Symmetry: D2
Subunit: 136 residues, 4 copies
């Protein structure tokens, strides 16, 4: 896994006193972006070129226990290529010090050619990076 | 239960790729849920304030079919189902109001738990009653 | 004033139990966008053209009392043109039923020519719309 | 007190105009404040949990000089000052880490109030102590 460290901020939380559900999914996307940056890939780069896009096409998340403002979390990310066009990120979000499981999530991402929005093969650079990140 | 929630896309909903950010569609789903609650005169805040129960969301999922842009007017169509004594399930479709183009489908699952022990409890009866929606066909 | 009605959602609130400070400023920008739309102006339009931009260059807000999830708020918006290039939106955020004052805010906005980002005169259509919205 | 908070711009921070949304800069300011608190082993959550006091933000302002984009690495430089027995003031500058281009300046003011009456109270001593910062020049 790639491990992304994330402190819970006040804005991540809601009036029930705990982290708001989709803020956990925000933390997941951050982990993904940080992994990209570590692999010298750049979401901004592909957006900027715009012969292609790499949209998220699915997200899902199960919640097991709440977190609170100030908590230090770890988001552990591993990724597998599901097909020519599509990869699947798996995330586990835990408390750093106890490894209490808070959530498990997936996001799926596809490459498309623009403007027609038709599936295109994942860039090899993404494929290569995904290979280096070991998935069960 | 069913509900149609009308939602304008604001600048903040969009991202640097020029389209609505994935997570903002899920936010709009929760808003539809909240608007339905309000229409049924139910209140998340009352649950929180009394502090005997919580109604955490325990699962969410969403699939994206097509993008939206700043200024678009969207419809979020919601159906609510009771899955167990303690759990209900919201099903959402998000579409363009004018063209009816389907942008996304989603689900959220919610459970009632007694606090502080966090053990499953029966849904509040008023909530069950709203979900049953016997007042409408 | 233009009056924008806004329900407080769970995501607007934080773990202290109340509306998070900058969510009030989000509601202000929404009121601004709704006013634009009512005047058949379009933030998306100017962004899309990109010979010009109309950025927010200042925001400030004072808080008087908290709000909670489920509250129904009114954001009252009035606007004055401060100079050739710049307008100033004033907002008052209150409880709908009691008119309890929650916050007062300002945002300032300027027109710039791109890509150089040099001040340009407000489009007359914006000037015209601003004139129709009465400011003390 | 002083602090330097390092912040990557994420896709969610940006909007459909292709730049960081104004309100997200203010979010980054509050994060700097929160990171400083953490570095001083202070906790907003502890205040909330105990429920004797609140530390609401009572004023915020921000001016924007230049935009940022997705992927940028920013520095938020924070200075904290005690303005009264019950009030402190955070001053922020946001810059590009590499070029040192100034993007924005901001201020937030915070007050301590006793609950439920919401009357001004003296800052918690540990907070005062952190702001005084006698351990550093």
């Amino acid at each position: 896994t790639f491990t992304y460290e994330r402190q819970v901020y006040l804005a991540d939380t809601d009036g029930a006193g705990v982290v708001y559900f989709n803020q956990f999914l925000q933390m997941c996307h951050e982990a993904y972006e940080s992994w990209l940056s570590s692999e010298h890939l750049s979401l901004q780069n592909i957006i900027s070129v715009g012969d292609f896009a790499l949209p998220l096409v699915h997200a899902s998340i199960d919640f097991f226990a709440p977190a609170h403002c100030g908590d230090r979390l770890l988001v552990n990310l591993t990724i597998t290529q599901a097909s020519a066009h599509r990869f699947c990120c798996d995330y586990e979000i835990s408390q750093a010090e106890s490894a209490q499981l808070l959530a498990r999530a997936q996001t799926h991402h596809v490459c498309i050619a623009l403007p027609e929005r038709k599936k295109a093969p994942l860039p090899q650079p993404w494929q290569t990076a995904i290979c280096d990140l070991d998935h069960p």
